[PDB]
Amino acid sequence: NKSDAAAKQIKKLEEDFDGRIGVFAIDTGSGNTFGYRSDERFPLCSSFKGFLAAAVLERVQQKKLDINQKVKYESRDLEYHSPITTKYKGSGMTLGDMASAALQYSDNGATNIIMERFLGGPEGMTKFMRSIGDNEFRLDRWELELNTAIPGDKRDTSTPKAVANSLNKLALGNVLNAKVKAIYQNWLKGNTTGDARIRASVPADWVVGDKTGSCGAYGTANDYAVIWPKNRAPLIVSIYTTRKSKDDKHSDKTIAEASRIAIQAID
Ligand SMILES: *C(=O)N1C[C@H](NOS(=O)(=O)O)CC[C@H]1C(=O)NC1CCNCC1
Ligand SMILES: [Cl-]
């Protein structure tokens, strides 16, 4: 009844903007779920950097890395959109600052730096997801080339569902121990790029941790979130979009609306 109405509204939303919306949304309290295209591949874009953040915290936990060890890169020519790494060019960042910045600011340099030195490249990142039972996630390329969002391209894609379940495992489950889990949570809650997406779909006093992605080709944009409504078990929302023509702009509003529809579906 609600599920049915939610999918009519979604498919009318994708018709309205002439592309493709993928949703999975979970109540971790009532186990109600809503899925639309939830097993299609969409480009990850910047959204994978929320999972990279977790990968970093797992290496810290294993004690291969210290969250406060200094990471230096004076040598380095920073990647387009390294808003945070560029200002710390002379001094170095701590590993934990760098990782948060990858997540919260979508800092490219931080992304590539961490994958080059700490995670074994894009197949390491891929391998990290496999290790938590996610068989859909694939990272093939580095910043910024992973953002081409070419139609029918496998590279640098995942599914709405797989992202949702993974975030569930990472943010809420038993992959990260207690202190490390708290940090990843605080990092997602601090994301700065999400104010027009899943955050716009929910009341002000709901707590939201998020990571967005904007490929900037085929109007490809996404967001995933953990949501803590006051007095309620967290929800996980995961929303991936593409559009039909290459030069079409991403739509913050389609995302926020699909979130609204998905949450009402599962609430
Ligand atoms: C990620 O999707 N990125 C990095 C950055 N933050 O994304 S957001 O969704 O967190 O706002 C902005 C755009 C995007 C990216 O790097 N896109 C490239 C811009 C330059 N060449 C085309 C793709
Ligand atoms: Cl180069």
Side-chain angles (χ1 to χ4, degrees), residues 73 78 82-91:
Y73 60 80
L78 291 156
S82 299
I84 297 284
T85 45
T86 64
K87 40 209 34 47
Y88 291 88
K89 213 197 177 201
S91 65

Side-chain angles (χ1 to χ4, degrees), residues 236-253:
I236 303 287
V237 165
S238 166
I239 318 256
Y240 282 75
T241 79
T242 49
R243 213 96 113 78
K244 292 280 135 295
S245 309
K246 186 174 185 279
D247 295 309
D248 286 318
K249 306 184 69 262
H250 62 240
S251 186
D252 282 7
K253 231 91 118 148

Side-chain angles (χ1 to χ4, degrees), residues 33-267:
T33 83
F34 171 91
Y36 185 90
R37 295 183 197 278
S38 64
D39 297 311
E40 314 204 348
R41 304 207 141 262
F42 290 77
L44 284 146
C45 327
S46 302
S47 83
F48 94 82
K49 307 160 171 182
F51 285 147
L52 171 144
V56 166
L57 282 164
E58 176 199 61
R59 305 322 197 78
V60 158
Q61 170 181 316
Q62 298 178 302
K63 283 209 45 184
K64 295 180 164 133
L65 305 180
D66 163 48
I67 207 164
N68 286 299
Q69 78 180 246
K70 196 102 335 177
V71 183
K72 254 191 132 30
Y73 60 80
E74 319 136 66
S75 269
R76 207 233 179 63
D77 187 275
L78 291 156
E79 284 87 350
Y80 179 66
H81 192 94
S82 299
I84 297 284
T85 45
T86 64
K87 40 209 34 47
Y88 291 88
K89 213 197 177 201
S91 65
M93 295 185 80
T94 77
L95 170 48
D97 289 341
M98 193 174 277
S100 46
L103 188 182
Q104 295 186 331
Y105 293 85
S106 217
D107 194 288
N108 291 317
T111 303
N112 280 351
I113 294 183
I114 279 158
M115 276 192 290
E116 69 192 57
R117 290 180 199 189
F118 300 129
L119 271 47
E123 78 151 357
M125 191 58 262
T126 289
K127 256 152 46 205
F128 170 69
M129 303 294 293
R130 286 298 167 283
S131 74
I132 59 159
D134 175 347
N135 298 318
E136 331 289 18
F137 174 109
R138 70 192 313 207
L139 209 77
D140 301 283
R141 297 174 287 170
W142 306 78
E143 289 296 4
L144 274 79
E145 177 194 10
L146 62 86
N147 298 288
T148 50
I150 305 164
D153 193 345
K154 200 135 288 269
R155 294 185 294 183
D156 314 293
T157 63
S158 202
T159 72
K161 193 172 298 200
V163 166
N165 282 346
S166 285
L167 176 89
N168 194 186
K169 290 181 221 140
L170 288 180
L172 294 176
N174 277 264
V175 178
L176 305 172
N177 88 355
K179 210 217 59 177
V180 160
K181 179 163 52 189
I183 302 188
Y184 184 39
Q185 275 171 10
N186 299 170
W187 285 5
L188 270 173
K189 287 173 184 171
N191 178 63
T192 65
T193 61
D195 298 330
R197 296 180 184 170
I198 294 167
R199 307 166 180 277
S201 81
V202 285
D205 42 352
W206 296 27
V207 194
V208 175
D210 96 282
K211 193 54 195 90
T212 53
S214 315
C215 278
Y218 295 87
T220 303
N222 52 58
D223 189 6
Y224 53 71
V226 187
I227 306 173
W228 298 269
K230 317 210 279 312
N231 357 103
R232 286 188 89 228
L235 312 179
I236 303 287
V237 165
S238 166
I239 318 256
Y240 282 75
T241 79
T242 49
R243 213 96 113 78
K244 292 280 135 295
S245 309
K246 186 174 185 279
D247 295 309
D248 286 318
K249 306 184 69 262
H250 62 240
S251 186
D252 282 7
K253 231 91 118 148
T254 296
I255 294 173
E257 190 65 7
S259 184
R260 278 178 280 240
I261 295 158
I263 295 177
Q264 284 168 18
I266 71 170
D267 202 355

